Design a protein around this ligand. Structure first.
Ligand SMILES: Nc1nc2c(ncn2[C@@H]2O[C@H](COP(=O)(O)OP(=O)(O)O)[C@@H](O)[C@H]2O)c(=O)[nH]1
Lengths: 298, 296
């Protein structure tokens, strides 16, 4: 089965994240941008662009109505997918209100439905935080798995201006999608295919992600240690009952290194965790390896 | 007009999406027109010509199109052949399609509608609006190619496969014919003979077949003629179009075997248009499309 994967970015933040995914060369997926601004969509490099809410301000009820009014068109665009990602920055109107509609359509159609969203920075204000909380609750009900990335924890990583901060958010949304899709589209020595991913992500519920990267001697152990200690995982890894871990490297990434990383992750996980390890070939990476952990159930 | 001017109009979200699929797959030799009919949403398109007359209901799309009839006419003027489709799903496109078709035909273009019947498992929305859409489009077209998606389940299909299959055959509803006209092969056709079987023909059905290796042309042609999408309309059809696509190496003998088979299968009084299409990207595969129009 050659899986058909679609990645939907909805609202300003989601469409910007999708643009970043395109710029960084994420392959094997169809990119769909949904927003309420036709000029912003003209700039997007997505394969499919839908402008919603045309007759209808950070009001999630407006975003929900705009998506619901477009539900036949969204369903037309998603029909045939085996897997749909719905990506957004939570806390605004279009993404907050519309993402559960998109996800519900994908789930009704039986696609493995993965949400990947951010919680807003605390400095964006209490209304955005409250709106994101409600949007996440709604989205969680419409997704198989919902990966939630707390933007506040990004400020504990990396170097930083406001534009820089939101570029880092774009990048972590990319990392969350690509960490999963590259297992399917560009596997390495340890092949974790669509059926395996569906096995662990179907109905898994809320999830967190951690990412790490390293180079040179001991890179895989270091990358895995960084990933499982990631601030984005909220010190929660030991409580997860389901863990998907992908390690990406060049063609020469060897079984010994892979196994070193897997063993570290096993030792850190809950005694009863179901953990699936997969590898990715990415010949652009040079001497670097990148470990992505998705932790769910919990 | 010794290069037939063919315009392919996608109207509504499903029809625009279908046109976008055709562009992505590199359908050559035709002009693409994307007409958005919804006020509340716009599906963007890479088509050459775009018209947003919206400013989900068949009557809404009909009035949107009627209100823009002068602009649509100017887009279509000069065409020898116009395809019109609302693609998969319903909505406002189902109301707009017969307006565009009526304009094309009043202009003198050979007007070919393409319409899908949804899978039975999709259910049915009220007033028999889908079948009313087919009847309205039929009344406005020279030939209406009807694709019954239910028959795809006879060609073990998964739900995602079923939806992808429907999209692929809709694309073939256009490309099988336009390639025969626009892309050279060993056996080429006169557009006048295409017009001869499709003008005023009414409903048509399509069959598709593919095969590889020895005997591939006969094999693919047998599959196409027996396709469940033709609903055994083949024996009674009074007009038959058949195109064989394959590489430049397709041999005259195997081509002629496939042509002989379709003549044997067709009604004795059928008009039959036959030709081939050189598509060197197919490798050793051949792809046959049969269009059966009219009836006994
Ligand atoms: N990844 C990313 N997130 C953003 C960006 N701009 C804003 N955000 C986040 O996304 C949330 C929603 O804003 P936005 O997507 O513009 O609102 P919407 O268009 O109404 O859904 C904001 O509160 C920010 O946390 C961006 O450029 N990239």
């Amino acid at each position: 089965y050659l899986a058909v994967i679609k990645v939907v970015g909805i609202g300003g933040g989601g469409v910007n994240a999708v643009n970043r995914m395109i710029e960084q060369g994420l392959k094997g997926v169809e990119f769909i941008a949904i927003n309420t601004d036709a000029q912003a969509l003209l700039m997007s490099d997505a394969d499919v662009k839908l402008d919603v809410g045309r007759d209808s301000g950070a009001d999630p009820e407006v975003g929900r109505k705009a998506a619901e009014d477009a539900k036949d068109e969204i369903e037309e665009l998603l029909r045939g997918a085996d897997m749909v990602f719905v990506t957004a920055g939570e806390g605004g109107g279009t993404g907050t209100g519309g993402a559960p509609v998109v996800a519900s359509i994908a789930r009704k159609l039986g696609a493995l439905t993965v949400g990947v969203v951010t919680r807003p920075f605390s400095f964006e204000g209490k209304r955005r935080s409250n709106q994101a909380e409600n949007g996440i609750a709604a989205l969680r009900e419409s997704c198989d798995t919902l990966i939630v990335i707390p933007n506040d924890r990004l400020l504990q990583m990396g170097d930083v201006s406001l534009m820089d901060a939101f570029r880092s958010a774009d990048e972590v949304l990319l990392n969350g999608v690509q960490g999963i899709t590259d297992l399917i589209t560009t596997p390495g020595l340890i092949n974790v295919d669509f059926a395996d991913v569906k096995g662990i992500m179907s109905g898994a519920g809320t999830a967190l992600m951690g990412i790490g990267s390293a180079r040179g001697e001991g890179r895989s152990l270091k990358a895995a240690e960084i990933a499982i200690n990631s601030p984005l995982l909220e010190a929660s890894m030991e409580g997860a009952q389901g863990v998907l871990m992908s390690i990406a490297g060049g063609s020469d990434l060897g079984l010994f290194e892979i196994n070193e990383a897997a063993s570290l992750v096993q030792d850190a996980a809950h005694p009863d965790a179901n953990i699936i390890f997969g590898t990715v070939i990415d010949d652009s990476l040079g001497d670097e390896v990148r470990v992505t952990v998705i932790a769910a159930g919990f």
